[PDB]
Design a protein around this ligand. Structure first.
Ligand SMILES: NC(=[NH2+])c1ccc2[nH]c(-c3ncccc3[O-])nc2c1
Ligand SMILES: [Ca+2]
Ligand SMILES: [Cl-]
Length: 223
């Protein structure tokens, strides 16, 4: 997160860290045994870490659960990142309390201008790499589809939306991939891609979760 602030320990209880010996992507807890992340975060050897704040110190509240399986969307395209969503099922269910909690899936898509909260342990510098120990947050609005398509001509599908600031300075970045974009208590986006981080007129692009709620429900109901 570039231009963001320290969220405060456990203030984003549905945020998870995907770990393979180090933090590589974020994700969102949607029920006690399922997490939602981005298809490009897929790898084997994933341990899901819940209740985290400092990812390098065990401070208490953490729950480390191995993924029993990851389900990448069958139509995911790694070259356009269209359908960039993945579901991870946990080996055991997580103990939910006030520090670890799930986030609701949306019943409707959000509109331009909606203010959302984006969080993650990704890079904090637009020019260079500084990775934080604690969770960073950024409040950003959903942009109109015309400005988004005007910024990335021919690269935005209907399963994507842009959120952020065209002036530059505040944005999600590498390490934040797979994490949440929550608007009004509902998970509306997943951090997917962008050009550099916090560059002028190059806002972040997010996977539009309202387009996949039945796919998520049907997939969880059968696995
Ligand atoms: N500018 C952004 N909003 C953005 C967000 C997530 C990103 N993730 C990545 C990324 N880059 C290199 C390897 C993996 C990644 O997820 N770039 C990203 C850029
Ligand atoms: Ca920790
Ligand atoms: Cl276009």
């Amino acid at each position: 997160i570039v231009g963001g602030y320290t969220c405060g320990a456990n203030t984003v209880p549905y945020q998870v860290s995907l770990n393979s010996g180090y933090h590589f992507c974020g994700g969102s807890l949607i029920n006690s045994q399922w997490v939602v992340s981005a298809a490009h975060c897929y790898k084997s050897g994933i341990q899901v870490r819940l209740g985290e704040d400092n990812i390098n110190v065990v401070e208490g509240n953490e729950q480390f659960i191995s993924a029993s399986k990851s389900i990448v969307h069958p139509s995911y395209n790694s070259n356009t990142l269209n359908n960039d969503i993945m579901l991870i099922k946990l080996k055991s269910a997580a103990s939910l309390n006030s520090r670890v909690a799930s986030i609701s899936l949306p019943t409707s898509c959000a509109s331009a201008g909606t203010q959302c909260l984006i969080s993650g342990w990704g890079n904090t510098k637009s020019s260079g790499t500084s990775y934080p120990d604690v969770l960073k947050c950024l409040k950003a609005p959903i942009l109109s589809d015309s400005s988004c398509k005007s910024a990335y001509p021919g690269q935005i599908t209907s399963n994507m939306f842009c959120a952020g600031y065209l002036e530059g300075g505040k944005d999600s970045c590498q390490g934040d991939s797979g994490g949440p974009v929550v608007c009004s208590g509902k998970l509306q986006g997943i951090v997917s891609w962008g050009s550099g981080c916090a560059q002028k007129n190059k806002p972040g692009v997010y996977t539009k979760v309202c387009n996949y709620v039945s796919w998520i429900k049907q997939t969880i109901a059968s696995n």
